[PDB]
Ligand binder design. Structure first.
Ligand SMILES: Nc1ncnc2c1ncn2[C@@H]1O[C@H](COP(=O)(O)OP(N)(=O)O)[C@@H](O)[C@H]1O
Ligand SMILES: [Mg+2]
Length: 214
């Protein structure tokens, strides 16, 4: 029986779209910090579970472990960052991942224009968009306790879509799927992934596991 998925399309806020264009079309040293930004986002999302739970018991009754899995797929040329954090409602995806201005965007674009390290992106409140250093398309599957499962997707170019995501239930949390650019396949290598997690992500307070395809 055929599923129906409602799809809505949204313009990125003016400066976020400009930032994405800058990120996409400019060479940066130190691209590898994208992974640090996504793991940090997962970590924040798991912190929120813990604070809902240390503070609102029904959350306590989940049996899911709080964790981050990294899943490179060399066949599909994707890298997926999965967490069991609080997830995002539909409103959350639309508001938080592209329609609302961030006060740091302009200053961050000026800093990059003046040759700052892309690694500074975490301090300007726009760290998610580092995904576009290495990915030509990003899909975010998400499931929050208060909503249905949603998929957000953008190949940049000024808009993104949010749609209900039916079947493949993922349970609470978020999966960010990076469809890597043809020249960024080094981020599918177990040794590369381990290197960058050790160098940039060693104070995450949750277990992170890397799934290596035999
Ligand atoms: N893995 C994730 N789980 C839940 N929400 C996530 C997420 N990754 C990103 N987000 C949402 O996207 C927002 C933007 O993230 P980012 O560009 O890194 O800025 P920041 N300082 O809030 O971490 C986050 O504040 C959060 O609301
Ligand atoms: Mg962040």
């Amino acid at each position: 029986p055929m599923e129906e998925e409602e799809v809505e399309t949204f313009a990125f806020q003016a400066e976020i779209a400009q930032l994405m264009s800058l990120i996409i079309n400019t060479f940066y040293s130190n691209k590898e910090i994208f992974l640090r930004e996504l793991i940090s986002n997962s970590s924040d999302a798991l912190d929120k579970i813990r604070y809902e739970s240390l503070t609102d018991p029904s959350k306590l009754d989940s049996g899911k472990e709080l964790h981050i899995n990294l899943i490179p797929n060399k066949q599909d040329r994707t890298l997926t960052i999965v967490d069991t954090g609080i997830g995002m409602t539909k409103a959350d995806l639309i508001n938080n991942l592209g329609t609302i201005a961030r006060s740091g965007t302009k200053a961050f674009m000026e800093a990059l224009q003046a040759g700052a390290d892309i690694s500074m992106i975490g301090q300007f409140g726009v760290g998610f968009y580092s995904a576009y250093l290495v990915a030509e398309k990003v899909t975010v599957i998400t499931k929050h306790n208060d909503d249905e499962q949603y998929a957000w997707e953008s190949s940049a170019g000024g808009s993104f879509t949010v749609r209900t995501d039916t079947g493949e239930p993922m349970g609470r949390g978020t999966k960010v799927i990076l469809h890597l650019k043809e020249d960024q396949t080094e981020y599918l290598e177990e040794r590369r992934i381990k290197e960058i997690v050790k160098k940039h992500s060693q104070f995450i307070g949750y277990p992170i596991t890397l799934f290596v395809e035999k």
